[PDB]
Amino acid sequence: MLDSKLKAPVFTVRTQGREYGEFVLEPLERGFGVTLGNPLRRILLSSIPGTAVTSVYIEDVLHEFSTIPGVKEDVVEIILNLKELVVRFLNPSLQTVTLLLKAEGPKEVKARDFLPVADVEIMNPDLHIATLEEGGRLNMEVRVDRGVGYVPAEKHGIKDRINAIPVDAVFSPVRRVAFQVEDTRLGQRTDLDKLTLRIWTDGSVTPLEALNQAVEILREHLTYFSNPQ
Amino acid sequence: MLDSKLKAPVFTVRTQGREYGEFVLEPLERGFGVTLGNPLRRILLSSIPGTAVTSVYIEDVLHEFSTIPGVKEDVVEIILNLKELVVRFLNPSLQTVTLLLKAEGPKEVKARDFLPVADVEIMNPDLHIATLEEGGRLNMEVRVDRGVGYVPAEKHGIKDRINAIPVDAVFSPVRRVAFQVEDTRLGQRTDLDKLTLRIWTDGSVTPLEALNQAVEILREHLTYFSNPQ
Amino acid sequence: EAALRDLDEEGVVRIGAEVKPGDILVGRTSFVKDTSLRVPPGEGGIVVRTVRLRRGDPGVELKPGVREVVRVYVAQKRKLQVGDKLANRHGNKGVVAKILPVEDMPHLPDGTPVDVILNPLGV
Amino acid sequence: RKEKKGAGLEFATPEEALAAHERGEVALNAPIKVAGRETSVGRLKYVFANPDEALLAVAHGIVDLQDVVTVRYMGKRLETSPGRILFARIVAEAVEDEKVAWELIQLDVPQEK
Amino acid sequence: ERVVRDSLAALYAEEDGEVAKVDGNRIVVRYEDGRLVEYPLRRFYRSNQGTALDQRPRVVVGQRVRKGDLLADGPASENGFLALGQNVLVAIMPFDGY
Amino acid sequence: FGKRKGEGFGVDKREVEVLRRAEKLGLVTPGKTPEEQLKELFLQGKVVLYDGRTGEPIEGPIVVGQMFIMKLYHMVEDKMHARSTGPYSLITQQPLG
Amino acid sequence: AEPGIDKLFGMVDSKYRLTVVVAKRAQQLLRHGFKNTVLEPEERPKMQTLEGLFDDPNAVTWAMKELLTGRLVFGENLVPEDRLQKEMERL
Amino acid sequence: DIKDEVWDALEEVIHGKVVLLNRAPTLHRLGIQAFQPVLVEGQSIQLHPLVCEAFNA
């Protein structure tokens, strides 16, 4: 484990909070920096399961292009703002949650105003939602689901209320990925590869577990080659 | 289940002898066709172990761009015709093998004309090495090592004799690989991938063996994320 | 009658109800022969407004022989897709030919990927 | 492509010029695609038994598809780029036979319209 | 800005004053004269060609405004600026054949 | 590039070989470090890009930037006037809907 | 394209004669059903998902690859026309 | 009520059929060209780039 494992990469991590994480793997034999960075980056940006808002119900309005009295924003603006809502599940078995929000009076309704739930966390309580001037009663429920990839609003078609309005969902916890390969020196061979990949996520999944899931997916996909026919 | 498991992507194989192999992975979900094809191609073209003619020494040769009397082929033609000589070692213990050739008389010299060695084997005995005009003094030896990929003669400079000449080494058994991903379709959706791998190998290893070694290398390199530091 | 559940009020479809092509929108009866306005083949969105003008004219007029009229507004949210076309301010007309996923698009050394790819040969 | 010759371009005469100009290419005396009198040092330095070897060496980033090099084709030694060899290979793969494909192409000029 | 002002698509403060109420459909503004005036909004108005004309409010409750200052967006204005389109990262290089 | 360096990174190997290729193409003056060579490349409006499908860099630099693109009025022009059997004309039997 | 369109242009003087003969061949292939074929034993059209090209997924290709064999003969007036033109339409 | 069996029947139907593509100003013979249809997902008709000059499109 020295000519081929000590001459093979130690794996270090550098994580700041649960949004940003660099992972360094050094040293790699020439040609495997990209060979590992590219598939990992594609899997991270493609198939990391996550959670996003799936449906919205307003106690007042009857369709999408309406407006609520006492509310500065249109319903379209409300859905646009709710789209960036970031939700962390705490129980892996939990799948679908229905947050409730009630507000009145001159309230700059932010995301923190949601009623607390047992195994749900909001990593962005400062997320602006609405602006209530006076006498405006804003009661809504938001159905958030755990999924994968990107899905159009109409394709899933979730109908809990006759007045519920479905929304587009972006189930990707990963904000972005950038892997860089650099040159490292070892005593016997001058040119070796050091692969450092930086991951920005939305906080719903810490970068380390995202990396582990991507590696697991890649391994299980390589498993398909094992049985020829 | 045909959504994920019944399309554990069917892996069909079409082998035309020990030189040509086509492998079809079908069906594969969106975006993973390239994600699997590209690293496999890099691995096959970069890291597969193999044996190649590292260097050659001839008795009467002083420079690599000289002419040998009694043989129509010059030094350059001799070494180029030597390049494609394919040899398989019998046991893993071998690292380097020096193989000599004594030949005279107005005859064709071929790979089969090499003096036999117990622990090496030649896949192309009928490889026409050269032609002897009339009693050509063909006194040569070749040092053949095991390696990976492609090594220009200049940098390694493996030397046995003072007047021995370096030879560019082609270790990789695979002659060349090409992957094509084309958009297949299932009963309901068309955003799916069909992966085709076409592999041409010298004959040292069947394309199935090379692909198995490639996937094993990739999986073992993935297993380097298991232990964090 | 099963599909009539969408036609909540008298003849007119209820506001805020999603409509598909081939669905009854206004139920009009002739001599009894059914001549009902339906969603045209193609696309349909969300009904937002309905206006009914009958013979009881407050200040309105109708074409002679027409007892009443109803107009229905259907709104839909078009999103960018393959069929659509785009252009800059310099006349570089175009059509969306393929919508690539984020992973396989060209990206900077930083993780940020580019949004749109333009063919240089048009310049 | 073609860039520059700041050194003595004469190569046909001296046979130490192979080693001398290989040493020069080790330094910045002459580029790999140098404008030599008879041949470029790229032709001398790299010689490929088969088109597959040339294209695989291109895959390893040693030489570009636009670099002249001596490749032993089916019967001859050609001083061409791996790009031209690859184009001939594409033509010969699209059709069944290669001798006909070799004869119906012009592999010494850029493929203009 | 000249295009969005001269085409009567947005709402502008006719006189120096302070906004009283801002809702999704009307804006009540009390000018410096003490007179309060209410501006309605064509929230979703069908155009001749079938597009939508919306006035999105651009002020907050109890916000001071200047003479001629913006109050609500036009159908295609960001903040008193003609905005019909998007700003995107474009790379000028030939992709496969698309 | 200052933000790039603050994270503690220099020049990628892919960028190094793309710089050498561009140097052979005369885009960037030779004899300079990748820092000022890449700065001169940026001055041209060209920056290195990575394919994303292969991971390998796009040979030669690419011009990238921010452009204003508008979606044009989209009436029935695109709509599929695709029919099989519908109403026919009265005077003549030509099909017209 | 189609199997051996150059070969098909080989044995016919004019392409229009080729079109006529192949389409007429498709016409009997419909009318008597695909039982009246001359390529039954081994070389049949082979469908991808299954052996669906055994019966009738496309008659034109059936007729064409029937024509590549030597089991098809055509002529201006090869048979007394009336008998077979009245026996063809009545079964 | 669409089902994947319906789409399998569709691909069965047009396995050998061809359709004629036509450009509105038909200035010559090649303004009409037959093609084999391939089922795609979208709104527009996908055309082979090489016939971009056979049609003046």
CB contact under 8 A, D3 and F24: yes
- Chains contacting A (3 or more CB pairs within 8 Å): B, C, E, F
Q: Name the residue type at position G30.
A: L
Host H or E run for residue C39: none
3-class DSSP state of E67 = coil
Let me know: does B153 contact B145? Beta carbons within 8 Å: no
Side chain identity at D26, as an amino acid letter? V
Select the residue of E21, E22, E24 nearest A74 (Cβ to Cβ). E24
Cβ–Cβ below 8 Å for H43 and C95: no
Whole-number CA gyration radius for chain F? 27
Residue of C102, C104, C105 for testing the chain B interface, max B β-carbons within 10 Å = C104
Residue type, A61: V
CA–CA min distance A168, chain E (Å): 20
Q: Which residue of B has its CA nearest to H8?
A: B187
| Interatomic CA distance for residues F63 and E89, integer angstroms | 11
Phi then psi dihedrals of residue H50, to 5 deg: -70, -20
- Per-position b or e across G54-82, b if 16+ CB within 10 A of its CB: eeebbbbbbbbbbbbeeeeeeeeeeeeee
Reading the block at residue C78, the tokens are: 């078009």
Residues 9-48 of H with CB under 8 A from F: 43-44
Strand partners for F88: F95
Burial of C67: CB neighbours in 10 Å, binned 0-12, 13-18, 19+: exposed
C117, two tokens: 């790819």
CA distance A185 to A200: 29
Supply the DSSP symbol for E57: B
- Spatial contact of B82 and B53, defined as CB atoms under 8 Å apart: yes
A221 membership: H or E segment, kind and range: helix A207-222
Looking at the DSSP bridge assignments, the partners of residue B89 are B120
Rounded CA-CA distance C96/D49 in Å is: 46
Angstrom resolution of this structure: 3.4
Residue D32: φ, ψ to 5°: -65, -45
8 Å CB contact between A106 and A65:
no
The 3-state secondary structure of chain G, one letter per residue: CCCCHHHHHHCCCCHHHHHHHHHHHHHHHHHCCCCCCCCCCCCCCCCCCCCHHHCCCCHHHHHHHHHHCCCCCCCCCCCCHHHHHHHHCCC
Tell me the residue length of chain G: 91
Two tokens, residue A151: 């899905």
Burial code of E43-74, b = ≥16 C-beta within 10 A, e = fewer?
bbeeeeeeeeebbbbbbebeeebeeebbbbbb
CB-CB: which of F9, F10, F55 is closest to A37?
A: F55
**Cα dihedral value E92, E93, E94, E96, nearest 10:** -120
Min distance C60 CA to chain F CA atoms (Å): 31
Of A179, A182, A175, A174, nearest in space to A217 by CA = A174
Chain A residues with CB within 8 Å of chain F CB: 22, 33-35, 37-38, 41-42, 180-183, 193, 196, 198
The amino acid occupying position A120 is: V
- Tokens found for residue C5: 């559940």
| Partner-chain contact F54 A38, CB within 8 Å | yes
> A110 and A125 in contact (C-beta within 8 Å)?
yes
Please, which residues 77-96 of chain F have a Cβ atom closer than 8 Å to chain A?
none
Is beta strand D47-48 parallel, antiparallel or unpaired with respect to D69-72? parallel
- Rounded distance between C-alpha atoms, residue B19 and residue B177, angstroms: 11
Chain E residues close to C116, C-beta within 8 Å: 88-91
The Cα–Cα gap between B34 and C104 comes to 9
Residues E55, E11: contact at Cβ < 8 Å? yes
The DSSP call for residue C115 is: S
Structure tokens at F83: 């029919």
CB contact under 8 A, A200 and C77: no
Q: What residue type is assigned to position B30 of the chain?
A: R
Contact D53, D59 (CB under 8 A): no
CB contact under 8 A, C46 and A63: yes
**Amino acid identity at B52:** A
Domain interval for residue A89: 49-170
Cβ C24 vs Cβ C13: under 8 Å = yes
CA separation for the pair H7, B127 (Å, rounded): 55
Kindly determine whether residue B30 and residue C101, on different chains, have CB atoms separated by under 8 Å: yes
DSSP structure class, residue F50:
B
Query: CA F77, CA F81: separation in Å to the nearest integer?
Result: 9
Query: In Å, how far from its chain's centre is CA A145?
Result: 12
3-state secondary structure of C19: coil
| 3-class state of residue A147 by DSSP | strand
DSSP B113: G
Q: Please spell the DSSP secondary structure of B29-82, one letter per residue.
A: ETTHHHHHHHHHHHHHHHT-EEEEEEEEEETT--STT---TTBSS-HHHHHHHH
Question: Rounded to whole angstroms, what are the CA distances from A5 to A1, A2, B95?
Answer: 4, 5, 20
B15 in contact with A, Cβ within 8 Å: no
Residue D85, both tokens:
């060899």
Beta carbons of B74 and B68 less than 8 angstroms apart = yes
We report the CATH number of the domain holding residue B98 as 2.170.120.12
Q: Return the SS3 of F42.
A: helix
Q: In the structure encoding, which two tokens stand for residue A12, read together?
A: 């270090």
Spatial separation of the C-alpha atoms in residues A154 and A150, rounded to whole Å:
12
Triad B216, B218, B221: Cα angle to 5°: 105
Residue C18 near residue C46 (C-beta atoms within 8 A): yes
B171 close to B149: Cβ distance less than 8 angstroms: yes
End-to-end CA distance of chain G: 34
Contact E38/E46 with Cβ under 8 angstroms? no
D21, D7 contact by CB (below 8 A): yes
β-strands A165-166, C29-30: how paired?
unpaired
Structure tokens at D25: 């290419």
Of E85, E92, E93, the CB nearest to F69: E85
d(CA C110, CA C103): 13
The helix (H) or strand (E) run that includes residue F86 is none
For the record, the structure tokens of B145 come out as: 């090592």
| Gap between the Cα atoms of D77 and D87, Å rounded | 17
CB contact under 8 A, C15 and A200: no
Of the candidates B97, B48, B98, the one whose C-alpha atom is nearest the C-alpha of residue B218 is B48
CB contact under 8 A, H42 and C82: yes
Q: What is the CA radius of gyration of chain E?
A: 18
- Rounded Cα–Cα distance for residues E65 and E29 (Å): 9
Structure tokens at B29: 């979900």
B20-29/B10-16 β-pairing:
antiparallel
Chains H and D in direct contact, meaning 3 or more beta-carbon pairs closer than 8 angstroms: no
Contact G18, G43 (CB under 8 A): no
F24 touches chain D (CB under 8 A): yes
- Cα–Cα distance between A149 and D16 in angstroms, integer? 64
CB pairs under 8 A between B and H: 13
Eight-state DSSP code of residue A115:
P
Collect all residues with Cβ–Cβ distance below 8 Å to F87 and sequence separation of at least 6: F95, F96, F97
Q: Answer for the pair F48, F57: CB distance below 8 angstroms, yes or no.
A: yes
Q: Are A11 and B227 in contact (CB under 8 A)?
A: yes
Record: contact E89-C115, CB cut-off 8 A: yes
Rounded-to-integer distance, Cα C101 and Cα B14, Å: 32
Nearest to B19 by CA among B207, B179, B150, B178: B207
CA distance linking residue D9 with residue C114, whole number of Å: 46
Residue A147: phi and psi, rounded to 5, are: -145, -165
What experiment produced this structure? cryo-EM
CA pseudo-torsion sign G58, G59, G64, G67: positive
Cα gap G58→B123, rounded to integer Å: 48
Q: Rounded to whole angstroms, what are the CA distances from E90 to A23, E85, F69, F70? A: 30, 14, 10, 13
